[PDB]
């Protein structure tokens, strides 16, 4: 965009789409700490909660 430094345009199959850069970095971040998962996995009052759970992970890569 001629008047913006915070947006970009991709020409996709059907048409052009202007995407606004604001909020892209925070939404993409998805890096769980291992320690926190161990706290949950070691439960003793809840059957289902440990049944769920068997460089840098991100929403985009996922």
């Amino acid at each position: 965009p001629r008047l913006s430094n915070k947006a970009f345009i991709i020409k996709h199959f059907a048409d052009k789409v202007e995407y606004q850069c604001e909020g892209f970095l925070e939404k993409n971040k998805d890096t769980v700490y291992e320690e926190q998962i161990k706290v949950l996995k070691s439960s003793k009052k809840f059957k289902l909660l440990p049944e769920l759970f068997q460089h840098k992970k991100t929403v985009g890569h996922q």
Partner: protein
């Protein structure tokens, strides 16, 4: 991304709202919910109600469908309880402290409910919200 963020005139996934509208019900009182403007993960877009929809009647239909497909009532309470903990986890606030670090406020009401619901220690969790292994030395994280 939708689980923890919403933009103007958008909601989180429907099940969270179906749960808040069903909050005053007797079986759901251990989940300890308020309305949708209470929780950080359901209040962001300013839209709490969809025109023409009773979120509570849809919860009745949702539970009935789980009953039809064999998710035993013991496991149904399982799912709703984890979702209530995700909702309470979202209102955990962090207060900045020396040397770019943080800590929870003393006796924190959202965190106390989160730990009760999940059945974990309070202090073990409170520690590892604000701290991280570097590998073996323990180091504080920024807010």
């Amino acid at each position: 991304s939708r689980v923890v963020f919403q933009a103007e005139e958008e909601r989180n996934y429907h099940i969270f709202y179906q749960l808040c509208a069903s909050a005053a019900l007797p079986e759901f009182k251990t989940l300890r919910l308020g309305n949708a403007n209470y929780f950080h993960y359901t209040k962001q877009g300013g839209s709490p109600v969809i025109d023409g929809i009773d979120d509570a009647k849809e919860m009745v239909n949702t539970r009935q469908a789980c009953t039809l497909l064999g998710i035993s009532d013991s496991y149904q309470m399982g799912i709703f309880r984890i979702l209530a903990g995700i909702l309470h986890l979202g209102n955990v606030e962090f207060a900045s402290r020396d040397s770019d670090s943080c800590a929870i406020p003393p006796k924190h009401d959202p965190l106390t409910i989160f730990c009760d619901l999940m059945g974990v220690d309070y202090e073990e969790m409170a520690h590892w919200l604000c701290h991280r292994k570097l590998a073996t030395y323990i180091k504080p994280i920024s807010k």
